Every structure is written in structure tokens, then in C-alpha cells.
Amino acid sequence: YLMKILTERGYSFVTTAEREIVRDIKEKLCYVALDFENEMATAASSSSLEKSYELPDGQVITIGNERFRCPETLFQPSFIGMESAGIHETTYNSIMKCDIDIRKDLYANNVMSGGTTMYPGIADRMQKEITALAPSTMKIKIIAPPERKYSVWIGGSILASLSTFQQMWITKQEYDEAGPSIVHRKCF
Amino acid sequence: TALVCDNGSGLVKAGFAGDDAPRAVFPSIVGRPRHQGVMVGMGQKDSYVGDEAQSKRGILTLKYPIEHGIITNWDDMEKIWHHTFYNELRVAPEEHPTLLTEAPLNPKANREKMTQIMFETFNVPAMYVAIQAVLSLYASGRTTGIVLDSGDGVTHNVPIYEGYALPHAIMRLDLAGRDLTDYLMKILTERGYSFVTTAEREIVRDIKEKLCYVALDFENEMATAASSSSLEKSYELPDGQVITIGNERFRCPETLFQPSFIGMESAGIHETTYNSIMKCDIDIRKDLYANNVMSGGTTMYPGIADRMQKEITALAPSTMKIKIIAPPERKYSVWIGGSILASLSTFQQMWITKQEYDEAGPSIVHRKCF
Amino acid sequence: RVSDEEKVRIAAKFITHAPPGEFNEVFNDVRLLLNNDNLLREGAAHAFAQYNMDQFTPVKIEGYEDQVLITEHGDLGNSRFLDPRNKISFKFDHLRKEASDPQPEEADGGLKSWRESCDSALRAYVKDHYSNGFCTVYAKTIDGQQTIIACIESHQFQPKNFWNGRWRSEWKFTITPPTAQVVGVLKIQVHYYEDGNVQLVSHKDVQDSLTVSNEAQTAKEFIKIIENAENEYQTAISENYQTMSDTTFKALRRQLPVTRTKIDWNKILSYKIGKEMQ
Amino acid sequence: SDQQLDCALDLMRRLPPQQIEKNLSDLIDLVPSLCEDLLSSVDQPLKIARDKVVGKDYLLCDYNRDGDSYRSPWSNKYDPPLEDGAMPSARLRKLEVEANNAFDQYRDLYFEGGVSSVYLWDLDHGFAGVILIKKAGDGSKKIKGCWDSIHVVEVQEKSSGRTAHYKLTSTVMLWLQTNKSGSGTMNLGGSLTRQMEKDETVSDCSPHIANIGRLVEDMENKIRSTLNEIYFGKTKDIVNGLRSIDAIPDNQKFKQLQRELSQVLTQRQI
Ligand SMILES: Nc1ncnc2c1ncn2[C@@H]1O[C@H](COP(=O)(O)OP(=O)(O)O)[C@@H](O)[C@H]1O
Ligand SMILES: [Mg+2]
């Protein structure tokens, strides 16, 4: 989507090598706005949100409001034509499909993981959206660790270093006896 | 000429009282545009109702006004009733009394707002509200028995003795064909098929209506499905792709008998029926066991009568005769019973007219009406 | 063995804990387990009277209608009781529950104008709400002041359908102008034993106040507070039955686990692993 | 003789199901001759003992009793310490530890607390087991009541071991008490007893523990649904049938044309 909307300023990226360049631009320059309409208004009003980036051939590009339109698709999936709800609404629907007595602890222990949760505005925006969706007497805490780009691996090392996980492996003899369908029996 | 309208959670069945079949059967959906309109030589509406939504669902977001039996959106229900009265029946609602249906064990404000909307916006000479399972028993030519009414939003077990429903034994299960469609959408992801959009939900509904069935023995059917590909069936998508399902044909309706498949606390329809029978007095239990009547479209799976017979025979005492009646027209059975009730001679003095509503207000339906 | 006095005491305990309707079966059980008729007929004879005075037993007398209630408030001694409406005294047989010797009795005229006004409205209320309902109104002086006691009873003994039930209600207020305190004790006991066994015992104490005026208005106020207490008690019992499976029964055994699914018995260690990481 | 035993059973059957131990304590001093008879034929709340070696509680019944001592399932030792007691075989003990672990997880998932015990012993061809579950209410969270459950399983093998026959019988005792402002006190208690038989295939994909736990789980869910719907619902109906709002001489005003509608509908159907 950033590759598509970079053509508004005349920057055309086509090949699969240039997709890596656009990904690097997204990792370096994009951020999540707290309020999208006020951010669009202050981007149109003044040239104070623009940033510059240098291409591998030395050319310099500048983006002003593509910085927060690119991760707005996580909150408004209709930008790429998708009918689904945002990540905040998906979180609220996941909490509302649980038991009613455990929703307090689920609302207080929201954990963000992965590389797409590394934009430097996403925790406050998610807090505002969930606090809008949740009832007014509930406490909402969203936890974003600084090392959350590698969090599946750390918990995997924790799980693999445990004494009671050593019986949960799928051994070779079990694969020989049961074929490649025991992974639906021993693994969740 | 009276009007019989069955506003279900998934379909609307409306027609004239006295006919043997409904004249307008259309889906209860409102579609709204999703994309950018670029051509100006076009009709370019903003809301599509019924079949016009289903013929345009690829550029539309579909909404059901009724969710789990209760009415969530009243503007969309107004649109549904307007399309029913003026476009599918071509009638004037100022001249015809209208019979309406309502699921049992429902909030009273739903009936209040139903009467208020039908008397203030679509002004009728008279109106009446009836229970759906009682009409389904009336359409089957009997006055005593238990009705299993499973549709798009609710499943109900209603026992009726001498034309009167027994309200202390009415059982409600919040599982019907919409939950089965969503569970089929969930379990088609195992074979690699992704269905997300509201338009593709109708495709999965068509798949469920076309290919699914009820296994007599679930464990043996899962054993035979994992031994050979004799149960795999193919379906052709609207875009020409061919999908194949082998054991999702009987796992999806098993949520009717094992409701924990979608994460619901209640018991299956067989235990629900046995509980509804067992709450009644002993001298009517023989008549209720002998007169099991199925109703609605969710009872149209081609294995449900034999399975229900086996399970109720297992639950009941061994000296009890179990007979389950599944009429071939049970997709239209509330409407036929409403047609029978509205064409009776003594029913014509049970209409709630407009003058009594003026003298009473939006609370007469709890005293003159059931 | 143990002394016969201890056996009499525990037989009286067994008799006084009998469910409504089931008296003759309990009597048969104790008379077949004790195997001594002479210690049962006279050694424990106040147990039968105490059970009849607690269960609010209605007895149909010869002649007049509206079977009267056997309470401890209308006890005359030598197994005699009184009827405040019929102005009569009779002898009650607890074993066969039979009324005999209906000798006339005369009460003082002070507690008469304040009694019939409450009695007529209480009979109207019991006819209006209770199906098989009986009611009695007593009026007597205890703490230097006359007071009114109301007793309401309804039983629905159906042994062929394997269940019995009983509603009892007692109300009391001391007549003293300009205001008085009403105190009510409400009891329900239900037994149902078709294929297994289930019992319900419940009681509620309600305290309120009312103003004091002429007899008709204070009778109407007494009926009004009785209605507004018992209606809320029955509605609260129904709403408590509505939310049993989510609040109180879930505290003993849940219907489904918190995963909302049945247990995968091939993956017990996968449930056990998740609690070992603080 | 036997008539006295039947009278005692019918006496304590219709006693309130909250004081079963207290009512049984002062019933047995009446006739202390059939004390050994009725204690193997009535249902009682379970007893909790503590294994000091492993630090866990374990339930006491008549299937782990050797005279007066009781065998612990966690440490396989008696308390008080005797010698040459009744013991399972090594295969049976290896089955029993897995059964105790699985039913501990079952008790954690479904009961969220309480004591569970599983005891196994050998038969002529198969093996039998008793599963005891006890849960009392949490006093810190203002819950008063108790649940007791006894399940007896008999397993008969079929030589080759492809399939096996399971027979289950269950007894559940229960009581609850709530104290609320609008309702006062509310006591509800009773007991149910049910049976089940089923033949099932046994392999590496489904051992004996999975089959027994599946049968016990289905039976417990069925008994809980039956207790909530049939019995408490009948009690609610009896309560509503004793006293009624929507007055009896006033609720017949809206049942006048209903009789005419019913009779002309029966005319139409005939
Ligand atoms: N042949 C069929 N097999 C299984 N389900 C069906 C079949 N035909 C219709 N249904 C289901 O019946 C449901 C609606 O039936 P019906 O009771 O007539 O409408 P409503 O529920 O709105 O009253 C639909 O959700 C549909 O999935
Ligand atoms: Mg319907």
C-alpha cells in the first residue's frame, strides 16, 4: 500500500528489489497517529511532518503524510479494499467471545508482539480505541515490550528449556508408527 | 383478505391468508455500497433489499436486521417490511389486516416496537402476533405435541397441549443455521479455503444447503471418512474454482447435537427435547413422545429424523413409542399454520384493531395477544 | 446400647424434620425401627403436636366450612384448640388428624372490632392469590398490649406425581397508635423425588412499619404490606432460579471449562505445561 | 430383618440432603445390628485425608480401605502404616498414576479446585476403578455448598485388545445455600444416580484412560444438566404453583375466545 501511494508524489517502485527499499522506508519513517483527521489537517496545513530519505543511487525523496496513512490500514482495512474490521475491533471481539468473569484480566493484560507492532504511535492509539470500545468502568492496559520483535523465539526457548516439555516431543518412532498425522494428535 | 408475514432471522415468507404456499420468500438482508461509484448513467441507489442484494452482493456489504431472533436494527426492519408490502406483494397495507410471528421467550419491548411500527408507519386495520411453533403444530393437523423449531437464529422446543403452549417447559437454544454457516466457514480453513466477506458467507450457506448431512453414528462416520475418499463431494464456486469436502459434511450439523463445537454451554437438541418433555406431567408425556414435529429449514438435513429417533429412543424409557414427524413442506410451516389460523371463523374477533390500540397504547399486546 | 430417653429425643428429631406430606411413611419407619409401641405413643407425644404446630396443619371440622389452622398460638391445653372465626373450641387428634368435641367458647370483646376487619381482607387476599389457600387471624394480648397474628398456608400434596410442597406465612403486629411495626416470617418447603431426590427449604424475615387509624384502613395497609413483601419474595426466588447455572452452580462445577470445549484426553500435558511459568 | 433395613433406607432417603452424616450418626444407635449393612448401601459425603510424604490431600472410600487403613494414590502407602496390604500390580499402578494425573487435570478444568482420587484394581479379565470427586465452596468468595461424585467403571478386555467394553455407574450428591436480600435464604440439595454401557475401540490413538475419562465427563455433564433443568425447574414450578401473582380470579379474563379457537381448530382438523 505504501508502494501504491508513493506514486502520488511521482516515486515509482515496481520490481521486487524496490519492494525491499519501500519496506526500509516504512521501517524508518512511518508512525501511527493518535488522531488521524487532525494529523491529516496539520499535514496539509504545514510542512513540518515531512521527512527525507536517501535511495541507494543517491536520490532523495520526501514523504509528508504517507508516514501515517500506511499503518492506518491496520485500523482502517478499507484502504486496501478489505471489508474486515481493524485490529482494535478484532481484539475487542476476541475479548467479547470469552467468559464474562475473565474479561477484566484480559483487558488489563493486552500484549503486543511482532514486527508490525513496532510503529512508534501504536500503543497509545490502541489504548484510545480499546478504551472507546470497552465499558467506561474497565481498566485497559496495553503492554508493548521493547524487545517484541523477537518474542515468539524467546518464549519458544523458554518452552524448550522446560523439564515437563521433554515428554511433549514427537519422537521418530512415533512418526514411523503413526505417519505424518500424529502432529494433529500431539500438537495443538 | 388477511396478510400472513413470517419475518424470520434469515428469510421472509409472506402471502395472503387462504393460499397453500407463500407468495414472497426472500432473504432478509440490506446491502449497502462498499466501493467508489464512477459511472453516472446508472440507477445508483444506496440500499438494496432482498434478492436485489443477492444479485449485487459482490460490491455490497450485507446486514441482517435480526440477530439471534431479536431485532437489532429497526430502520432495516422498516425497509424489509416496506419492500415486503410494496414490492414483493404489491398490496396496500391500509386495507389488509396483517398477521405477524414471534419466537417464544422473547423480550416484551420487541413486541411493543413491532406493534408501534405496524400501527404508526404501515397503518393496518388490525394486527395479531402469534408464536411460530404453535402455528407449525397447527399446520401439521394436530393439537397436541412438541415442536422443534430450528431456523436461522434460534432453536426452540415448545410443547403444546390442547392448543395451548406450556410456558414452563419452553426450551430455547441459541444455535441455528447462522452459527452452522459460521462454523463451516471456520472449518473450511483446514483444507485451505478462505471465506471472510459477507458475500462469501452466502456462498458457504449455499454449500451447507447443498452438501451437508447428519451422520447416524458420528465416530463411525469419522472412522469411515478417514479410511477412504468415498464421502468426498465437490462444489463449483461462482468464479469457476472447484472445492472438495470430505468430512465437513457431517461435522457441521453435529453442533446441533454437540453445541460445544462452537463453544456454547447448552446441550444438544435431543437432550433439549427430552428436557422439554420431562418437565410436563406424566399423563401427557406419552402424547408428547408420540407427536414430535420438526419445523424450519435447519431440520432439512437428510439425516436428522433417524438420528433424532435414535437419541430420543436412547433417552426415553424402553416401553415408550417414539414417532418423529418431519413434513416435506416444513420450510414453510409457520406460514401455513398462520394461513389456517387467519382463515378461521372465530379468529376474526381476536384481531387487535386500531381503536383498542388508541385506547390502550403500546402495551395491549401483553393482554389481548400471546 | 443407649438409654431410651436418647432414643425418644432422636425419634422426636426425626419426626420434626419430616418433609410436608410425608408423615405416615416416617411414622411407619420409626415404628418399625424402634419395635416398641409403648415408648412411641406416650414417650414422644409432643413431637406430633410440635410438627402439626410448625407445619400449619389444616383440619376440616364437622359442620362449618373453611378448615382451620393448627398453630402454637391457639393452643388451649389438653389437646384443645380454638377457632377465632367460628368462636368455638375443639379437640384435635394429631395421629389421625381428626377434629372432635366442638364445644363453644367466648372471647373478650376488646379484640373483636380490630380482628374481623383484618380477617375479611385476609380471606379476600388468600382467595385472590392462593389457589388451595387457608388463613387464620388471631388476636391476643402478651406484652401488656393486644396484637394481631396472621397465618397463611397452602399445600399441594401430589404423591402420584412424586412431589409435595408447602407455603407457610406468619405475620404479626401490635396495635398501638399512631404507628406500628409489622414482622413477617415466610417459609417454603418443596420435595420432589421422581427418579432421584431434590428438596428446597427457604425462609425470609421482613420488617416494616405502618400507620394506625380506624380498622378498615389499617387492615388495607396490612394487606398492602403483605402483598408488597410476598410478591417481591416470589419474584426474587424466580430470578434466583434464573441465574443459578451462571453464579452459584458455577462455583461448584462449571458446565464447560474456560476453554469452552471438551477435554482432549491425548493432550493432558499441554494443559499442565501452561501453569509452570509463574 | 430386611424390612427394618428397607424402612431405614426409606427413612433416611426423605431426610434433608445437607445433614447426611449427622442424620446417619444418630440413626445407627437405634438398631446397631445392620450397621455393616447400610454403610455399604447408602451414599455419603467423602472424607479428606492428607499424605504427609507428598503433601497432597486424597479421598477416603471403601475401595481403598484395608480394615481401618487407607491406601494413598500419590505415594502408594497406607495410613496407618500396615504391612502386606492390598496393592495393585505394576502395570495397574502405572495405569493408576496416569489416571490420577488425567483426572487431576479434569478436576482443575471443570471444578477449579477440590480433591480428586482414582483407585484401580484387577478383575477376572479386565479392571475396575472408582473415581471420587469432592468440592466444597469457597468461603472467601461467599459460596456455601458442596458437590460429591462417585463413579464406578468396569472394563472387560477382548483378548486381542482391539476393542473393550466399559460399564459406568455414577452417584452425585449436591447442596447449595444462598443468602440474598430479596430472597432471604435458599437451600437446594439432592442426589442422582445413573448408569451407562458402551463398547469402544482401544489403540494407541485412544487408550483406556481417554475412554474412561470421556464416559465420566459425559455422565457428569448430563447429570449437571438434569439437576439444573429437570429437578430445580420442577421445584420452581411447584413454588409458582403454590402461590401466584397475576391473580387467580383475574387471569381468566384473557382466556375466553381461546376455547372457541381451540374447538373450531379441532373441528377443522377432524
Ligand atoms: N436443504 C437445507 N439443508 C440445511 N439447511 C437448510 C436447507 N435449506 C435451508 N436451510 C437453512 O434454513 C435456514 C432458514 O430456514 P427458515 O426457518 O425457513 O428461515 P428462518 O430461519 O428465517 O425462519 C437458513 O439459514 C438455511 O441455512
Ligand atoms: Mg422461522
**Domains contained in chain B, CATH given:** 1-26+68-133+333-366 (3.30.420.40), 27-67 (2.30.36.70), 134-180+270-332 (3.30.420.40), 181-269 (3.90.640.10)
Clarify whether residues C118 and C28 are in a common domain: no
Whole-angstrom distance, CA of residue A44 vs CA of residue A33? 15
Three cell numbers written together for C15:
419426626
Determine what percent of chain B falls in helix, strand and coil, rounding each to the nearest 5: 40, 20, 40
| Spatial contact of C104 and C88, defined as CB atoms under 8 Å apart | yes
Alpha-carbon gap: C120 to the closest alpha carbon of chain B (Å) = 30
Alpha helices in chain A (DSSP H): 2-5, 16-29, 36-45, 66-69, 87-96, 103-108, 122-133, 152-160, 172-178, 183-186
What experiment produced this structure? Answer: cryo-EM
Helix (H), strand (E) at residue D28? none
Q: Which residues of C111-149 are buried (b: 16+ CB within 10 A; e: fewer)?
A: beebbebbbebbbebbebbbeebbbbbbbeeeeeebbbb
| Spatial contact of A83 and B196, defined as CB atoms under 8 Å apart | yes
Three cell numbers written together for A13:
517502485
Clarify whether residues C60 and C13 are in a common domain: yes
Clarify whether residues C248 and C115 are in a common domain: yes
**Structural domain includes residue C120:** yes
3-state secondary structure of B124: coil
Count other C-beta atoms under 10 Å from residue B252's C-beta.
28
Whole-angstrom distance, CA of residue A3 vs CA of residue A21? 10
Write the DSSP string, B58-109. GGEEEE-SEETTEE--HHHHHHHHHHIIIIIS---TTSS-EEEEE-SS--HH
Q: How wide is the angle at C-alpha B241 spanned by C-alphas B235 and B247, nearest 5°?
A: 35
Whole-angstrom distance, CA of residue D134 vs CA of residue A24? 61
**Structural domain includes residue C272:** no
**Structural domain includes residue C82:** yes
Clarify whether residues C179 and C55 are in a common domain: no
- CA C31 centroid distance within chain: 26
From C79, C107, C135, the end of a domain falls on C107
Clarify whether residues C248 and C112 are in a common domain: yes
Q: Which domain holds residue C115?
A: 108-252
Mutate to test the interface with B, among D255, D260, D270 (most CBs of B within 10 A): D260
Whole-angstrom distance, CA of residue C199 vs CA of residue B205? 47
- Residue type present at position D29: D
Give me the helix-helix angle, C215-242 and D232-242, nearest 10°: 170
C266 CB within 8 Å of a chain A CB = yes
Looking at the structure of chain C, the number of domains it has is 2
Which is it for strands D115-122 and D127-136: parallel, antiparallel or unpaired?
antiparallel
Count other C-beta atoms under 10 Å from residue B206's C-beta.
13
From C107, C142, C172, the end of a domain falls on C107
B247 alpha carbon – ligand 1 mean position (Å): 21
- Using alpha carbons, select from C185, C192, C188 the residue that is nearest to residue C234: C188
- Residue type present at position C159: P
Whole-angstrom distance, CA of residue B233 vs CA of residue B290? 36
Helix (H), strand (E) at residue C28? helix C24-34
Would the CB atoms of C128 and D247 count as touching at under 8 Å?
yes
Starting from the CA of residue B153, give the closest ligand: 1
Count other C-beta atoms under 10 Å from residue A51's C-beta.
15
Q: Tell me the C-alpha to C-alpha distance, in Å, between residue C239 and each of A101, C236, C247.
A: 20, 5, 12
Q: Is B114 exposed, middle or buried (0-12, 13-18, 19+ CB in 10 A)?
A: buried
Half-sphere exposure of D270 (CA within 13 A, CB side): 6
All residues at 6 or more sequence positions from C72 whose CB lies less than 8 Å from its CB, including other chains: C53, C54
| Spatial contact of C26 and D11, defined as CB atoms under 8 Å apart | yes
- CA A97 centroid distance within chain: 21
Alpha-carbon gap: C203 to the closest alpha carbon of chain D (Å) = 6
Q: Is the CB of B360 under 6 A from ligand 1?
A: no
Tracing cell 500419590 back to the chain, one arrives at: D74
Helix (H), strand (E) at residue C71? none
Ligand 1 atom closest to the Cα of residue B181 is: 27
Ligand 1 atom closest to the Cα of residue B295 is: 17
Clarify whether residues C101 and C120 are in a common domain: no
Name B6's bridge partners.
Answer: B13
Whole-angstrom distance, CA of residue C253 vs CA of residue D219? 13
B212 alpha carbon – ligand 1 mean position (Å): 12
Q: How wide is the angle at C-alpha C140 spanned by C-alphas C137 and C146, nearest 5°?
A: 110
Q: How wide is the angle at C-alpha B76 spanned by C-alphas B72 and B79, nearest 5°?
A: 150
Clarify whether residues C13 and C73 are in a common domain: yes
Name C208's bridge partners.
Answer: C182
All residues at 6 or more sequence positions from C211 whose CB lies less than 8 Å from its CB, including other chains: C178, C179, C218, C221
Q: Tell me the C-alpha to C-alpha distance, in Å, between residue B287 and each of B293, C194, D88.
A: 12, 20, 52
Whole-angstrom distance, CA of residue D196 vs CA of residue C32? 36
3-state secondary structure of B330: coil
Clarify whether residues C217 and C82 are in a common domain: no
Name B105's bridge partners.
Answer: none
Ligand 1 atom closest to the Cα of residue B132 is: 23
Nearest chain A residue to C256, by CA: A99
Q: Which residues of A69-86 are buried (b: 16+ CB within 10 A; e: fewer)?
A: bbbbebbebeeeeeeeeb
Would the CB atoms of A162 and C276 count as touching at under 8 Å?
yes
| Spatial contact of B96 and B123, defined as CB atoms under 8 Å apart | no
Select the residue of C129, C253, C259 nearest D244 (Cβ to Cβ): C129
Clarify whether residues C57 and C149 are in a common domain: no
Across B229-370, where does the E strand assignment appear? 233-236, 242-245, 292-295, 324-325, 352-353
Whole-angstrom distance, CA of residue C157 vs CA of residue B14? 49
Whole-angstrom distance, CA of residue B267 vs CA of residue D224? 11
**Structural domain includes residue C182:** yes
Which is it for strands B70-71 and B66-67: parallel, antiparallel or unpaired?
antiparallel
Three cell numbers written together for B79:
425497509
Alpha-carbon gap: D92 to the closest alpha carbon of chain C (Å) = 19
**Structural domain includes residue C258:** no
Q: Is the CB of B336 under 6 A from ligand 1?
A: no
**Structural domain includes residue C265:** no
Phi then psi for residue C134, to 5 deg, are -125, 150
Three cell numbers written together for B277:
418433555
Tracing cell 485451505 back to the chain, one arrives at: B192
B332 alpha carbon – ligand 2 mean position (Å): 8
**Structural domain includes residue C269:** no
Whole-angstrom distance, CA of residue B261 vs CA of residue C260? 9
Q: Is B342 exposed, middle or buried (0-12, 13-18, 19+ CB in 10 A)?
A: buried
| Spatial contact of D72 and D82, defined as CB atoms under 8 Å apart | no
**Structural domain includes residue C134:** yes
Q: Is the CB of B26 under 6 A from ligand 1?
A: no
Across chain D, where does the E strand assignment appear? 47-51, 56-60, 65-66, 69-71, 78-79, 115-122, 127-136, 144-157, 163-180, 184-201
Three cell numbers written together for D249:
380470579
Q: Tell me the C-alpha to C-alpha distance, in Å, between residue C146 and each of B76, C105, C140, C212.
A: 67, 19, 5, 14
From C91, C107, C123, the end of a domain falls on C107
Clarify whether residues C61 and C174 are in a common domain: no
Whole-angstrom distance, CA of residue B111 vs CA of residue B357? 13
